[PDB]
Short mmCIF file of C-alpha atoms and ligand atoms in Angstrom, two decimals:
data_model
loop_
_atom_site.label_atom_id
_atom_site.label_comp_id
_atom_site.label_asym_id
_atom_site.label_seq_id
_atom_site.Cartn_x
_atom_site.Cartn_y
_atom_site.Cartn_z
CA UNK A 1 0.00 0.00 0.00
CA UNK A 2 2.99 2.22 -0.74
CA UNK A 3 3.61 2.99 -4.45
CA UNK A 4 1.87 5.88 -6.21
CA UNK A 5 2.46 8.33 -9.05
CA UNK A 6 3.38 11.24 -6.79
CA UNK A 7 6.43 13.18 -8.06
CA UNK A 8 8.18 12.86 -4.72
CA UNK A 9 8.94 9.70 -2.77
CA UNK A 10 6.58 7.01 -3.98
CA UNK A 11 6.96 8.17 -7.53
CA UNK A 12 8.05 5.92 -10.37
CA UNK A 13 11.73 7.03 -10.38
CA UNK A 14 11.93 5.58 -6.90
CA UNK A 15 9.72 2.46 -7.18
CA UNK A 16 12.73 0.13 -6.95
CA UNK A 17 13.57 1.87 -3.68
CA UNK A 18 10.09 1.41 -2.21
CA UNK A 19 10.35 -2.35 -2.40
CA UNK A 20 12.92 -4.85 -3.58
CA UNK A 21 10.27 -6.60 -5.74
CA UNK A 22 10.23 -3.48 -7.81
CA UNK A 23 13.98 -3.63 -8.22
CA UNK A 24 13.47 -4.64 -11.85
CA UNK A 25 11.71 -1.33 -12.33
CA UNK A 26 15.31 -0.11 -12.43
CA UNK A 27 17.49 -3.09 -13.24
CA UNK A 28 15.50 -4.58 -16.12
CA UNK A 29 16.51 -3.83 -19.72
CA UNK A 30 13.01 -4.27 -21.17
CA UNK A 31 11.03 -1.80 -19.10
CA UNK A 32 7.83 -0.29 -20.40
CA UNK A 33 6.55 2.18 -21.64
CA UNK A 34 8.66 3.60 -24.52
CA UNK A 35 8.51 5.78 -27.67
CA UNK A 36 8.10 3.54 -30.69
CA UNK A 37 10.38 5.12 -33.18
CA UNK A 38 12.34 2.35 -34.86
CA UNK A 39 10.60 -0.72 -36.21
CA UNK A 40 10.48 -3.29 -38.96
CA UNK A 41 7.75 -3.66 -41.55
CA UNK A 42 6.22 -7.01 -42.26
CA UNK A 43 -1.61 -11.81 -38.24
CA UNK A 44 -1.53 -15.16 -36.49
CA UNK A 45 -3.52 -13.33 -33.87
CA UNK A 46 -7.04 -14.44 -33.05
CA UNK A 47 -9.56 -12.67 -30.87
CA UNK A 48 -12.13 -14.64 -28.99
CA UNK A 49 -14.11 -11.75 -27.59
CA UNK A 50 -17.72 -11.45 -26.67
CA UNK A 51 -19.81 -8.90 -24.95
CA UNK A 52 -19.16 -9.94 -21.38
CA UNK A 53 -20.46 -9.11 -17.95
CA UNK A 54 -17.62 -8.34 -15.49
CA UNK A 55 -16.82 -10.55 -12.56
CA UNK A 56 -16.23 -7.23 -10.85
CA UNK A 57 -15.67 -3.60 -11.79
CA UNK A 58 -13.48 -1.50 -9.60
CA UNK A 59 -10.93 1.24 -9.28
CA UNK A 60 -7.79 -0.26 -7.75
CA UNK A 61 -4.22 0.96 -7.44
CA UNK A 62 -5.00 4.21 -9.29
CA UNK A 63 -6.71 2.84 -12.47
CA UNK A 64 -10.27 1.87 -13.41
CA UNK A 65 -10.50 -1.87 -13.77
CA UNK A 66 -13.02 -4.37 -14.95
CA UNK A 67 -12.11 -7.91 -14.03
CA UNK A 68 -13.49 -10.80 -16.02
CA UNK A 69 -14.26 -14.46 -16.14
CA UNK A 70 -11.95 -16.68 -18.18
CA UNK A 71 -14.42 -16.76 -21.10
CA UNK A 72 -12.72 -14.36 -23.53
CA UNK A 73 -9.49 -15.42 -25.25
CA UNK A 74 -6.73 -14.28 -27.50
CA UNK A 75 -4.82 -16.92 -29.33
CA UNK A 76 -1.27 -16.02 -30.28
CA UNK A 77 1.05 -18.42 -32.11
CA UNK A 78 -1.14 -21.35 -31.17
CA UNK A 79 -1.43 -20.44 -27.47
CA UNK A 80 -4.52 -19.15 -25.68
CA UNK A 81 -4.17 -16.04 -23.59
CA UNK A 82 -7.07 -15.40 -21.20
CA UNK A 83 -8.21 -11.83 -20.67
CA UNK A 84 -7.97 -11.01 -16.99
CA UNK A 85 -9.04 -7.44 -16.93
CA UNK A 86 -9.17 -4.22 -18.85
CA UNK A 87 -8.03 -1.09 -17.15
CA UNK A 88 -7.16 2.37 -18.14
CA UNK A 89 -4.17 4.64 -17.98
CA UNK A 90 -4.42 8.40 -18.45
CA UNK A 91 -2.57 9.76 -20.26
CA UNK A 92 -1.43 7.11 -22.73
CA UNK A 93 1.77 5.48 -21.53
CA UNK A 94 3.28 4.25 -24.83
CA UNK A 95 4.33 6.68 -27.49
CA UNK A 96 4.37 6.12 -31.24
CA UNK A 97 6.86 8.20 -33.25
CA UNK A 98 6.75 11.05 -30.78
CA UNK A 99 2.88 11.09 -30.68
CA UNK A 100 0.58 11.21 -27.63
CA UNK A 101 -3.08 10.62 -26.97
CA UNK A 102 -4.70 11.53 -23.60
CA UNK A 103 -6.01 8.02 -22.79
CA UNK A 104 -5.52 4.28 -23.30
CA UNK A 105 -6.97 0.95 -22.15
CA UNK A 106 -5.02 -2.18 -21.40
CA UNK A 107 -6.31 -5.64 -22.17
CA UNK A 108 -4.40 -8.08 -19.94
CA UNK A 109 -3.95 -11.77 -20.85
CA UNK A 110 -2.22 -14.88 -19.50
CA UNK A 111 -1.65 -18.28 -21.16
CA UNK A 112 -1.18 -21.88 -20.03
CA UNK A 113 2.40 -21.12 -18.92
CA UNK A 114 1.36 -17.89 -17.16
CA UNK A 115 2.94 -15.59 -19.77
CA UNK A 116 1.50 -12.10 -20.25
CA UNK A 117 -0.03 -10.49 -23.35
CA UNK A 118 -1.16 -6.89 -22.99
CA UNK A 119 -2.86 -4.67 -25.53
CA UNK A 120 -2.67 -0.90 -25.60
CA UNK A 121 -5.10 1.16 -27.63
CA UNK A 122 -5.92 4.81 -27.66
CA UNK A 123 -8.92 7.01 -27.37
CA UNK A 124 -9.25 10.16 -29.44
CA UNK A 125 -11.12 13.27 -28.33
CA UNK A 126 -14.24 13.42 -30.46
CA UNK A 127 -17.49 11.49 -30.64
CA UNK A 128 -18.81 9.60 -27.61
CA UNK A 129 -18.07 5.88 -27.89
CA UNK A 130 -20.80 3.61 -26.37
CA UNK A 131 -18.47 0.83 -25.31
CA UNK A 132 -17.50 2.78 -22.24
CA UNK A 133 -20.96 2.86 -20.76
CA UNK A 134 -21.49 -0.73 -19.51
CA UNK A 135 -18.49 -0.36 -17.22
CA UNK A 136 -19.20 3.24 -16.14
CA UNK A 137 -22.54 2.00 -14.87
CA UNK A 138 -21.00 -0.86 -12.88
CA UNK A 139 -20.11 0.56 -9.50
CA UNK A 140 -22.53 -1.82 -7.83
CA UNK A 141 -26.12 -5.92 -11.32
CA UNK A 142 -23.12 -5.54 -13.68
CA UNK A 143 -24.13 -4.96 -17.36
CA UNK A 144 -22.46 -6.84 -20.23
CA UNK A 145 -19.39 -5.19 -21.78
CA UNK A 146 -19.05 -5.16 -25.57
CA UNK A 147 -15.57 -6.60 -26.01
CA UNK A 148 -15.87 -7.87 -29.57
CA UNK A 149 -17.01 -4.39 -30.54
CA UNK A 150 -14.49 -2.42 -28.49
CA UNK A 151 -11.51 -2.70 -30.89
CA UNK A 152 -11.39 -1.82 -34.62
CA UNK A 153 -12.10 -4.70 -37.01
CA UNK A 154 -9.01 -3.72 -38.97
CA UNK A 155 -5.90 -2.92 -36.98
CA UNK A 156 -2.29 -1.80 -37.53
CA UNK A 157 -0.10 -2.60 -34.54
CA UNK A 158 3.34 -2.62 -32.94
CA UNK A 159 4.64 -5.77 -31.33
CA UNK A 160 7.63 -6.09 -29.04
CA UNK A 161 8.80 -7.45 -25.71
CA UNK A 162 8.53 -5.23 -22.67
CA UNK A 163 7.53 -5.01 -19.02
CA UNK A 164 4.53 -4.04 -16.94
CA UNK A 165 4.09 -0.32 -16.75
CA UNK A 166 3.25 -0.70 -13.05
CA UNK A 167 5.03 -2.40 -10.14
CA UNK A 168 6.40 -4.97 -9.88
CA UNK A 169 7.19 -4.07 -13.49
CA UNK A 170 7.44 -7.74 -14.33
CA UNK A 171 8.89 -8.53 -17.72
CA UNK A 172 8.20 -11.20 -20.30
CA UNK A 173 5.40 -9.03 -21.62
CA UNK A 174 4.27 -9.32 -25.24
CA UNK A 175 3.03 -5.88 -26.12
CA UNK A 176 0.75 -5.09 -28.98
CA UNK A 177 0.22 -1.38 -29.36
CA UNK A 178 -2.57 -0.50 -31.76
CA UNK A 179 -2.09 2.46 -34.07
CA UNK A 180 -5.71 3.40 -34.68
CA UNK A 181 -7.09 5.64 -31.94
CA UNK A 182 -10.56 4.89 -30.58
CA UNK A 183 -12.76 7.89 -29.94
CA UNK A 184 -13.58 9.49 -26.64
CA UNK A 185 -15.82 12.42 -25.93
CA UNK A 186 -14.63 15.45 -23.95
CA UNK A 187 -17.42 14.89 -21.35
CA UNK A 188 -16.49 11.24 -21.00
CA UNK A 189 -12.82 12.19 -20.79
CA UNK A 190 -13.15 14.49 -17.82
CA UNK A 191 -15.76 12.23 -16.19
CA UNK A 192 -13.61 9.08 -16.19
CA UNK A 193 -10.45 11.06 -15.30
CA UNK A 194 -12.37 11.97 -12.15
CA UNK A 195 -12.47 8.27 -11.34
CA UNK A 196 -8.77 8.59 -12.00
CA UNK A 197 -9.11 11.28 -9.33
CA UNK A 198 -8.00 13.70 -12.05
CA UNK A 199 -4.57 12.50 -10.94
CA UNK A 200 -2.41 11.02 -13.69
CA UNK A 201 -1.75 7.30 -13.52
CA UNK A 202 0.86 7.15 -16.31
CA UNK A 203 4.33 5.63 -15.96
CA UNK A 204 7.05 7.67 -17.74
CA UNK A 205 8.96 6.42 -20.76
CA UNK A 206 11.63 3.94 -19.75
CA UNK A 207 15.19 3.71 -21.18
CA UNK A 208 15.19 1.94 -24.61
CA UNK A 209 17.87 -0.68 -25.39
CA UNK A 210 17.20 -1.03 -29.14
CA UNK A 211 13.97 -2.91 -28.67
CA UNK A 212 13.10 -4.96 -31.71
CA UNK A 213 9.67 -3.91 -32.96
CA UNK A 214 7.56 -5.31 -35.82
CA UNK A 215 4.74 -3.37 -37.48
CA UNK A 216 2.01 -5.57 -38.80
CA UNK A 217 -1.72 -5.74 -39.25
CA UNK A 218 -4.62 -7.98 -38.41
CA UNK A 219 -8.37 -8.35 -38.37
CA UNK A 220 -9.96 -8.51 -34.95
CA UNK A 221 -13.45 -9.56 -35.91
CA UNK B 1 33.19 -21.50 -6.35
CA UNK B 2 33.02 -21.38 -10.17
CA UNK B 3 30.32 -22.04 -12.79
CA UNK B 4 30.37 -25.02 -15.14
CA UNK B 5 28.17 -26.91 -17.58
CA UNK B 6 28.59 -30.10 -15.52
CA UNK B 7 25.74 -32.23 -14.08
CA UNK B 8 25.82 -31.24 -10.44
CA UNK B 9 25.95 -28.09 -8.35
CA UNK B 10 27.87 -25.66 -10.52
CA UNK B 11 25.82 -26.40 -13.65
CA UNK B 12 23.54 -24.08 -15.75
CA UNK B 13 20.46 -25.04 -13.78
CA UNK B 14 22.24 -23.53 -10.79
CA UNK B 15 24.21 -20.55 -12.04
CA UNK B 16 21.86 -18.18 -10.18
CA UNK B 17 22.71 -19.89 -6.94
CA UNK B 18 26.49 -19.51 -7.37
CA UNK B 19 26.71 -15.74 -7.21
CA UNK B 20 24.09 -13.05 -6.62
CA UNK B 21 25.51 -11.30 -9.66
CA UNK B 22 23.98 -14.26 -11.49
CA UNK B 23 20.38 -13.80 -10.27
CA UNK B 24 19.14 -12.85 -13.74
CA UNK B 25 20.32 -16.18 -15.12
CA UNK B 26 17.10 -17.71 -13.88
CA UNK B 27 14.79 -14.76 -13.20
CA UNK B 28 15.27 -12.80 -16.44
CA UNK B 29 12.59 -12.81 -19.07
CA UNK B 30 14.87 -12.43 -22.06
CA UNK B 31 17.40 -15.19 -21.48
CA UNK B 32 19.53 -16.85 -24.18
CA UNK B 33 19.98 -19.18 -25.99
CA UNK B 34 16.61 -20.08 -27.39
CA UNK B 35 15.04 -22.23 -30.03
CA UNK B 36 14.32 -20.03 -33.03
CA UNK B 37 11.06 -21.20 -34.70
CA UNK B 38 8.80 -18.16 -34.77
CA UNK B 39 9.94 -15.01 -36.52
CA UNK B 40 8.90 -12.21 -38.73
CA UNK B 41 10.05 -11.84 -42.28
CA UNK B 42 11.08 -8.29 -43.18
CA UNK B 43 12.86 -6.11 -45.71
CA UNK B 44 16.38 -4.82 -45.60
CA UNK B 45 16.02 -1.49 -43.90
CA UNK B 46 18.55 -3.25 -41.68
CA UNK B 47 21.32 -0.80 -40.91
CA UNK B 48 24.09 -3.31 -40.18
CA UNK B 49 27.40 -2.60 -41.89
CA UNK B 50 30.58 -4.43 -41.14
CA UNK B 51 33.82 -2.69 -40.60
CA UNK B 52 36.09 -5.70 -40.26
CA UNK B 53 39.70 -6.23 -41.24
CA UNK B 54 42.39 -8.82 -40.74
CA UNK B 55 43.55 -8.33 -37.18
CA UNK B 56 46.03 -9.99 -34.87
CA UNK B 57 44.45 -10.92 -31.53
CA UNK B 58 45.71 -9.25 -28.41
CA UNK B 59 45.57 -12.82 -27.14
CA UNK B 60 44.28 -16.30 -27.75
CA UNK B 61 43.62 -18.23 -24.62
CA UNK B 62 41.36 -20.59 -22.82
CA UNK B 63 39.06 -19.02 -20.28
CA UNK B 64 35.71 -20.15 -18.79
CA UNK B 65 35.19 -23.34 -20.86
CA UNK B 66 35.77 -21.58 -24.18
CA UNK B 67 38.48 -20.71 -26.62
CA UNK B 68 38.70 -16.96 -26.89
CA UNK B 69 40.50 -14.51 -29.14
CA UNK B 70 40.44 -10.96 -27.92
CA UNK B 71 41.29 -8.14 -30.27
CA UNK B 72 42.65 -4.69 -30.60
CA UNK B 73 39.79 -2.25 -30.84
CA UNK B 74 40.36 -2.10 -34.59
CA UNK B 75 37.41 -4.14 -35.83
CA UNK B 76 33.86 -2.70 -35.82
CA UNK B 77 30.17 -3.18 -36.47
CA UNK B 78 27.78 -0.33 -37.28
CA UNK B 79 24.13 -0.60 -36.35
CA UNK B 80 21.75 2.32 -37.08
CA UNK B 81 24.42 4.98 -36.58
CA UNK B 82 25.62 3.16 -33.47
CA UNK B 83 29.12 1.60 -33.86
CA UNK B 84 30.06 -1.55 -31.86
CA UNK B 85 33.72 -2.51 -31.47
CA UNK B 86 34.65 -6.18 -31.50
CA UNK B 87 35.86 -7.31 -28.10
CA UNK B 88 36.51 -10.97 -28.71
CA UNK B 89 35.55 -14.10 -30.60
CA UNK B 90 34.85 -17.25 -28.61
CA UNK B 91 33.39 -20.65 -29.20
CA UNK B 92 30.60 -22.94 -28.20
CA UNK B 93 30.30 -26.65 -28.98
CA UNK B 94 27.69 -27.53 -29.77
CA UNK B 95 26.12 -24.34 -31.07
CA UNK B 96 23.92 -22.80 -28.38
CA UNK B 97 21.08 -21.17 -30.38
CA UNK B 98 18.85 -23.46 -32.34
CA UNK B 99 17.60 -22.65 -35.80
CA UNK B 100 14.28 -24.37 -36.17
CA UNK B 101 15.38 -27.05 -33.69
CA UNK B 102 18.51 -27.76 -35.66
CA UNK B 103 21.81 -28.36 -33.93
CA UNK B 104 25.26 -27.37 -35.13
CA UNK B 105 28.43 -28.94 -33.76
CA UNK B 106 29.93 -25.49 -33.12
CA UNK B 107 29.39 -21.73 -33.01
CA UNK B 108 31.26 -18.43 -32.91
CA UNK B 109 30.25 -15.25 -31.11
CA UNK B 110 31.37 -11.83 -32.18
CA UNK B 111 31.12 -9.86 -29.02
CA UNK B 112 30.83 -6.10 -29.28
CA UNK B 113 30.52 -3.20 -26.88
CA UNK B 114 29.72 0.40 -27.67
CA UNK B 115 31.11 3.24 -25.52
CA UNK B 116 28.28 3.07 -22.98
CA UNK B 117 28.59 -0.67 -22.63
CA UNK B 118 25.79 -1.78 -24.94
CA UNK B 119 26.23 -5.34 -26.14
CA UNK B 120 25.96 -6.85 -29.55
CA UNK B 121 26.77 -10.46 -30.07
CA UNK B 122 26.96 -12.08 -33.41
CA UNK B 123 26.42 -15.81 -33.72
CA UNK B 124 27.18 -18.22 -36.54
CA UNK B 125 27.13 -22.00 -36.59
CA UNK B 126 29.75 -24.31 -38.05
CA UNK B 127 29.16 -27.45 -40.03
CA UNK B 128 31.61 -30.34 -40.37
CA UNK B 129 33.18 -30.37 -43.80
CA UNK B 130 36.08 -28.71 -45.57
CA UNK B 131 39.28 -27.52 -43.94
CA UNK B 132 38.61 -24.04 -42.65
CA UNK B 133 41.71 -21.92 -43.32
CA UNK B 134 40.61 -19.16 -40.97
CA UNK B 135 40.49 -21.53 -38.02
CA UNK B 136 44.06 -22.72 -37.81
CA UNK B 137 45.57 -19.23 -37.31
CA UNK B 138 43.57 -19.42 -34.12
CA UNK B 139 44.67 -22.97 -33.56
CA UNK B 140 48.17 -21.71 -34.37
CA UNK B 141 48.04 -18.81 -31.94
CA UNK B 142 46.83 -20.56 -28.80
CA UNK B 143 50.11 -22.34 -27.90
CA UNK B 144 52.13 -19.21 -28.59
CA UNK B 145 52.27 -16.38 -26.07
CA UNK B 146 49.84 -13.90 -32.81
CA UNK B 147 48.96 -14.20 -36.50
CA UNK B 148 46.45 -11.91 -38.28
CA UNK B 149 42.87 -13.16 -38.18
CA UNK B 150 41.14 -12.94 -41.51
CA UNK B 151 38.05 -11.38 -40.03
CA UNK B 152 37.70 -9.63 -43.34
CA UNK B 153 37.32 -13.13 -44.70
CA UNK B 154 35.70 -14.82 -41.75
CA UNK B 155 31.99 -14.24 -42.25
CA UNK B 156 30.01 -14.84 -45.46
CA UNK B 157 29.48 -11.90 -47.79
CA UNK B 158 25.80 -12.54 -48.03
CA UNK B 159 24.14 -13.62 -44.79
CA UNK B 160 20.65 -14.47 -43.65
CA UNK B 161 20.36 -13.64 -39.96
CA UNK B 162 17.88 -13.42 -37.11
CA UNK B 163 17.78 -10.36 -34.89
CA UNK B 164 16.35 -9.95 -31.38
CA UNK B 165 17.23 -8.95 -27.83
CA UNK B 166 18.48 -11.60 -25.44
CA UNK B 167 21.16 -12.20 -22.85
CA UNK B 168 24.75 -13.37 -22.57
CA UNK B 169 24.65 -17.16 -22.61
CA UNK B 170 27.10 -17.53 -19.72
CA UNK B 171 27.04 -15.90 -16.26
CA UNK B 172 26.24 -13.10 -15.37
CA UNK B 173 23.59 -13.61 -18.11
CA UNK B 174 23.37 -9.90 -18.74
CA UNK B 175 20.25 -8.89 -20.69
CA UNK B 176 19.77 -6.10 -23.21
CA UNK B 177 21.92 -8.01 -25.69
CA UNK B 178 21.33 -7.42 -29.40
CA UNK B 179 21.68 -10.82 -30.94
CA UNK B 180 22.40 -11.41 -34.59
CA UNK B 181 22.25 -15.04 -35.42
CA UNK B 182 23.42 -15.84 -38.92
CA UNK B 183 21.65 -18.75 -40.59
CA UNK B 184 24.34 -19.96 -42.98
CA UNK B 185 26.68 -22.40 -41.23
CA UNK B 186 30.40 -22.17 -41.83
CA UNK B 187 32.57 -25.16 -42.69
CA UNK B 188 34.98 -27.07 -40.45
CA UNK B 189 37.18 -30.17 -40.88
CA UNK B 190 36.72 -33.28 -38.71
CA UNK B 191 40.04 -32.85 -36.94
CA UNK B 192 39.66 -29.08 -36.74
CA UNK B 193 36.41 -30.02 -35.02
CA UNK B 194 37.95 -32.70 -32.86
CA UNK B 195 41.09 -30.84 -31.85
CA UNK B 196 39.45 -27.61 -30.72
CA UNK B 197 37.06 -29.45 -28.43
CA UNK B 198 40.17 -30.66 -26.70
CA UNK B 199 41.40 -27.08 -26.48
CA UNK B 200 37.99 -26.41 -25.07
CA UNK B 201 38.93 -29.38 -22.93
CA UNK B 202 36.24 -31.67 -24.32
CA UNK B 203 33.73 -30.38 -21.77
CA UNK B 204 30.66 -28.97 -23.60
CA UNK B 205 30.09 -25.28 -23.03
CA UNK B 206 26.53 -25.10 -24.27
CA UNK B 207 23.89 -23.46 -22.10
CA UNK B 208 20.55 -25.23 -22.44
CA UNK B 209 17.71 -23.53 -24.28
CA UNK B 210 16.04 -20.97 -22.03
CA UNK B 211 12.39 -20.14 -21.44
CA UNK B 212 11.03 -18.06 -24.24
CA UNK B 213 8.58 -15.27 -23.47
CA UNK B 214 7.38 -14.80 -27.06
CA UNK B 215 10.61 -13.21 -28.18
CA UNK B 216 10.02 -10.94 -31.16
CA UNK B 217 12.44 -12.03 -33.91
CA UNK B 218 12.92 -10.68 -37.45
CA UNK B 219 14.57 -12.49 -40.36
CA UNK B 220 16.52 -10.49 -42.88
CA UNK B 221 19.75 -10.70 -44.79
CA UNK B 222 22.75 -8.52 -45.52
CA UNK B 223 26.09 -7.79 -47.13
CA UNK B 224 28.99 -7.50 -44.77
CA UNK B 225 31.67 -6.54 -47.30
C1 MZM C 301 -3.99 -7.71 -12.84
C2 MZM C 301 -3.21 -6.73 -13.68
O1 MZM C 301 -3.51 -6.56 -14.84
N1 MZM C 301 -2.13 -6.03 -13.09
C3 MZM C 301 -1.32 -5.09 -13.77
S1 MZM C 301 -1.41 -4.63 -15.23
C4 MZM C 301 -0.29 -3.62 -15.45
S2 MZM C 301 0.00 -2.79 -16.97
N2 MZM C 301 -0.71 -1.37 -16.72
O2 MZM C 301 -0.60 -3.45 -18.09
O3 MZM C 301 1.37 -2.61 -17.36
N3 MZM C 301 0.41 -3.45 -14.22
N4 MZM C 301 -0.25 -4.41 -13.15
C5 MZM C 301 0.14 -4.58 -11.80
C1 MZM C 302 34.11 -10.83 -22.64
C2 MZM C 302 32.94 -11.65 -23.12
O1 MZM C 302 32.72 -11.68 -24.31
N1 MZM C 302 32.13 -12.37 -22.18
C3 MZM C 302 31.00 -13.18 -22.48
S1 MZM C 302 30.36 -13.47 -23.84
C4 MZM C 302 29.17 -14.40 -23.59
S2 MZM C 302 28.12 -15.05 -24.83
N2 MZM C 302 28.33 -16.67 -24.93
O2 MZM C 302 28.44 -14.42 -26.07
O3 MZM C 302 26.76 -14.72 -24.60
N3 MZM C 302 29.07 -14.66 -22.22
N4 MZM C 302 30.23 -13.88 -21.52
C5 MZM C 302 30.47 -13.88 -20.13
CL1 CL C 303 -0.05 3.36 -23.78
CL1 CL C 304 25.15 -20.21 -30.81
ZN1 ZN C 305 -2.19 -1.00 -17.89
ZN1 ZN C 306 29.34 -17.27 -26.46
#
């Protein structure tokens, strides 16, 4: 109950100091997030999403989280990665070619061997997107969340190996950062940021050791 | 208390236990070597230009289960406007990385460091066959206390290689290593093969394949000279 985003002691630059489990926050060579600037052009990525009702929806450790039953899958290279939860970071943590959007959502998965697959996608200030509403009315039954409709059908993405953007900053993370921004309204932006206590929950860009990145594309649905 | 590839306490399964400097040997998520089966095909935007010449080793000696030739900082690799000087060339038998589950009887690692200590290792396998003329200058320098190494002739002109980030394959298992594994195997004679294993004291110095956390690998090819 110690680490936060405050620019003083419990801030990110000192996370390794708060606890030894966070030592990799400093010592690891694949820490996330980063600015995606150098990559290689070149699917094998299957979504198994459905509109799903959350096991629970809650704000925890400074983000808004919807936890889920092991019913929604992503298959990657012939291995099934179960979605655990989707949570939000504001502003966006990852950067693409020096570009920033004010919000992202992370879709967290784990396979048979316990390996992590996380998805980062942006929101763009503009028209109100309906997908947000089933979770924002879930403080208490829980209404179904439209997962198979959340992401674009056609996606361009960046894939690389990184770490968690939050303590313990565990590595072995397969990142897929989606290029296409989703849309978010200005009223929704401020409203949900208030559940982010209008206090940023975004880890700074980590040092980049020539991460190998592929740019590819896929169809989600 | 020193690390080995032997069956008991100082083996690879236990390197982490030998020294705390070696903790990442087990706990790291980007540990080498691995079995290369999944990769991405790509184009040649690859900024990898060799700056190699024939060079006489500062020394050729046995250290840590391998045969090593260290060099004057005269031989280089350039990668995206980032130049890596060759530190040494050393050997593994059998080859430590696997290319589609295929095993080579031997490999060579071209170990580089930039100014700030960033690591680039270059790996190529060897296949039993014709007398390799480049090898014996090394086999002719180890009992002395050194002849030019035809580095300018050592690697193939046209290479297919795999690129990714991994670790050193021996303790301290340092991560953040830019690996370039070249697909085309070089050629070695049966006695060149036999003899050097004895200079590597006939005790295999091959770290087992490590857990792979979906390492992102690209396949491309290039011209060295
Ligand atoms: C359960 C879960 O998803 N935990 C997470 S996710 C995460 S992140 N924001 O994807 O890098 N950091 N932590 C602690
Ligand atoms: C000086 C030097 O090259 N040391 C090395 S190289 C190496 S390797 N087998 O290339 O990953 N492991 N260690 C300890
Ligand atoms: Cl992000
Ligand atoms: Cl190897
Ligand atoms: Zn997240
Ligand atoms: Zn080696």
